[PDB]
């Protein structure tokens, strides 16, 4: 079911990582932008 | 705090791993808007 | 559509103009992502 | 218009960036207007 290769696992996690270490007004923009590529 | 806190980001973490992978590139890339300087 | 695509890039491009700077400047990093 | 109070920099910085984004293909156009929408109040 997870079919992610490693090095698309740390990028995904390194994505976590950089939006949790944005300020919190960045990351509800991160949010609103999510989902305009949302199908 | 808390609580809302962790909802919204299982659920926009959630959301970037329901895209697809062009998608989560792109998203990537964005992201990085935010911390280049 | 030309109609169509004209008014929704000039829609687009007031937008950005009535934008705050550092909106504007975030939206021009944004757009170098797609370029 | 005549009551455009940028600074030529900040006005060829803009005319840059719509030129940057005519040149796009129309899928990325479109999602870049997505984008947008969310920076508004």
Redesign the interface.
């Known amino acids: 079911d997870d079919l992610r290769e490693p090095e ?1 696992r740390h ?2 996690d ?3 990582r ?5 300020e919190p007004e ?2 509800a ?11």
């Open positions: 698309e990028l995904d390194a994505f976590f950089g939006y949790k270490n944005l960045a990351k923009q991160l949010r609103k932008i999510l989902d305009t590529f949302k199908k």
